[PDB]
Design a protein around this ligand. Structure first.
Ligand SMILES: C[C@]12CC[C@H](O)CC1=CC[C@@H]1[C@@H]2CC[C@]2(C)C(=O)CC[C@@H]12
Ligand SMILES: C[C@]12CC[C@H](O)CC1=CC[C@@H]1[C@@H]2CC[C@]2(C)C(=O)CC[C@@H]12
Lengths: 284, 284
């Protein structure tokens, strides 16, 4: 009927805001398929959809576990239009804490969901976009996929991974007509974000007293950055729209130019010592 | 007794050459624990060890599956000295082909071995190095972890991941005394390398005729680069030694400056369009 968009991880954050922003667009040219792991959490999405008065039939919810390829396939078929014009790979997972204190299953989960998950999506929907000779894929990144952050080893690993995966495809898709873009977000006003950060005893028993004291220092400094730089999801969700409408999209979109200074000096010295020292001071 | 080194994935390539290079060092100051997934492949290592006349007791082989944490633990205990001074995380896995043609288990395997595997190693040996206040960790990288390469989506994903994981730890380890370094290798004279590349029908039935024709073009161009830039493992294995002896090691060591030009222009334009076009031409 009109631009068919499918978004993953819509139970909150960028995903939820992006879905309603699309569905409630005045032009009414978007049909949105919001995906969620557990449906019992679709409440907030629907409540937000009523707040913005989304016309009936512009928003549909599907249960989709990106950790499972059978659920990825079952979903693709629930797509009545029989076509996907815009795939937004947003499902993500975070992990904070010193490496040694992280469980093995947790580390495997973050990579399975964040990296293998978007690969599974790309596999089930990419072929068709190549046949057509047209398609758009949006992947939500982070500045943590452009530079390493202490205590975010595995999170950064998964996001750094997305940069490599996407940068590789882009080289090959250029002549196929389907465009791929990464949306590099900095912190994004998530009240829950600054509440997850705060793990005293549980962490303290799996690490030494000096790593723990540094963790505290990281938490302290991060909550300061969050409160002084976090942007509104509407500002971020609108960058996706800018990427979505560019006639010839670039590979990377930055929601903010704030962290660009730090990224520069990391590209100025390929050996990485300047960045490692610079970043160590702005956190310790 | 003397610098205790433990290396992973020693059945061939960098791993095997590095192990004997260490063990057979004239100073005799290195005790080497070469690790392998399957012991039935330790032949080449021993044969190479005799060729360089490694003194008895300077080289020991251990079976270690980095895909399993119980095997990682059992190994750490087989370390008689009760200490590891240099951990070299070398176990790696490659994957070539268009995304849609790759199996799901294969993609999961490459990340489990390449990324989660080195995380498991870091978890079992990092704490002790922090207690001591001294330690050295060497991780073998690739230029494919610094820039995306067509048809190497998942391989680059895993190597890009190592850059993020390591860059993150380095920020936190700086004041602990344990150093971490990545050894960025370009192609390395592996006869088997240019033989793996060559998948006609099997690939052709899981992808379209235009992606397949491009694959052929990639294979063709890559074998040209391999034959005109691949370096000797002794040249590469010696970079590890340079990193190992620097009083204050940097975070990144490049075995060659050849691919540095391309890396520069990728750091000159953060949006990534210049790189994507530049790389598309030098391969198509
Ligand atoms: C590392 C950095 C940015 C640099 C600051 O000094 C510390 C910091 C805290 C929280 C991080 C953020 C980068 C963007 C992150 C990763 C998100 O994507 C959520 C909270 C975020
Ligand atoms: C992408 C690139 C380097 C750029 C060339 O145009 C194409 C090419 C072929 C083989 C790749 C290599 C980078 C280094 C790699 C990844 C290895 O690590 C083994 C063979 C290698």
């Amino acid at each position: 009927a009109r631009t068919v968009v499918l978004i993953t991880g819509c139970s909150s954050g960028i995903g939820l805001h992006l879905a309603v922003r699309l569905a409630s667009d005045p032009s009414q040219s978007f049909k949105v398929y919001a995906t969620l792991r557990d449906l019992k959490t679709q409440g907030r999405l629907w409540e937000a959809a009523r707040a913005l008065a989304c016309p009936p039939g512009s928003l549909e919810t599907l249960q989709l576990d990106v950790r499972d390829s059978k659920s990825v396939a079952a979903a693709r078929e629930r797509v009545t239009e029989g076509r996907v014009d815009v795939l937004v790979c947003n499902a993500g997972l975070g992990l904070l804490g010193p490496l040694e204190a992280l469980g093995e299953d947790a580390v495997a989960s973050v990579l399975d969901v964040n990296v293998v998950g978007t690969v599974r999506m790309l596999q089930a929907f990419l072929p068709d976009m190549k046949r057509r000779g047209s398609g758009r894929v949006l992947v939500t990144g982070s500045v943590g996929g452009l530079m390493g952050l202490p205590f975010n080893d595995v999170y950064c690993a998964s996001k750094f991974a997305l940069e490599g995966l996407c940068e590789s495809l882009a080289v090959l898709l250029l002549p196929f007509g389907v465009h791929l873009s990464l949306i590099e977000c900095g912190p994004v006003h998530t009240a829950f974000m600054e509440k997850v950060l705060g793990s005293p005893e549980e962490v303290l028993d799996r690490t030494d007293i000096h790593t723990f004291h540094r963790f505290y220092q990281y938490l302290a400094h991060s909550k300061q950055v969050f409160r002084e730089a976090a942007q509104n999801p509407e500002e971020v969700a609108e960058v996706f729209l800018t990427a979505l409408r560019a006639p010839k999209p670039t590979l990377r979109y930055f929601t903010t130019e704030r962290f660009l200074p730090l990224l520069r000096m990391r590209l100025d010295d390929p050996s990485g010592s300047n960045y490692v020292t610079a970043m160590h001071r702005e956190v310790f």
